[PDB]
């Protein structure tokens, strides 16, 4: 029952889109941050989200192609060769005992 990311599809044609799903979200959640790569790093922040106010805040890795949803799904449109790789979600919780999962897709 741990937080896990699923890409659909894993293998994406250039120019198409990919949806990153989050399974087993904790009950306690208040927000989300999606990062490019394998770890929480503010310099790789794509977008943060506050559930209660439905504020999305782009980070430095935001490229105008990424959308976050209230179930923590990340949609990335119009993918390029450069997007292949890892994506890491942190779920922020009200007690701040946060959870992380990663996150992978491939562009041909």
């Amino acid at each position: 029952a741990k937080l896990t990311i699923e890409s659909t599809p894993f293998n994406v044609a250039e120019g198409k889109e990919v949806l990153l799903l989050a399974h087993n979200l904790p009950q306690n959640r208040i927000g989300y941050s999606w990062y490019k790569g394998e770890r929480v790093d503010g310099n790789s922040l794509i977008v943060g989200y506050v559930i209660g106010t439905q504020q999305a805040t782009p980070g430095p890795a935001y490229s105008g192609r990424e959308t976050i949803y209230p179930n923590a799904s990340l949609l990335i449109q119009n993918v390029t060769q450069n997007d292949t790789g890892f994506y890491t979600l942190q779920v922020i919780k009200s007690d701040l005992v946060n959870e992380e999962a990663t996150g992978q897709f491939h562009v041909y």
Partner: protein, 108 residues
């Protein structure tokens, strides 16, 4: 920028290190300290939620650590095995965050 100063940075075994935090952002919600160089729930030492002063011991807690508000971490009774990196994540009110590491060593 956010910064960490190990006082002292090289400590005799059985004494104590204080990790002082400088330049906290103005709008903190809470904090988590981690063993190592990255944010990873599995290596979380301790956290703190300001609004309700809730302290949150994590899997890397050893019954020696104290988190103050300001985010400073005191580790009493240090061993050679405590030498290494320590990473602070500061979650802000808007759920954006900042990370900083974090080193000290221990002798005798």
């Amino acid at each position: 920028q956010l910064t960490i100063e190990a006082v002292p940075s090289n400590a005799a075994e059985g004494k104590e290190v204080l990790l002082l935090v400088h330049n906290l952002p103005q709008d903190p919600r809470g904090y988590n300290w981690y063993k190592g160089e990255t944010v990873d729930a599995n290596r979380r030492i301790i956290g703190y939620v300001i609004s309700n002063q809730q302290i949150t011991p994590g899997p890397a807690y050893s019954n020696r650590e104290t988190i103050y508000p300001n985010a400073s971490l005191l580790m009493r009774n240090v061993t050679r095995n405590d030498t290494g990196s320590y990473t602070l994540q500061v979650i802000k009110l808007n759920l954006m965050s900042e990370e900083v590491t974090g080193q000290f060593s221990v002798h005798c």
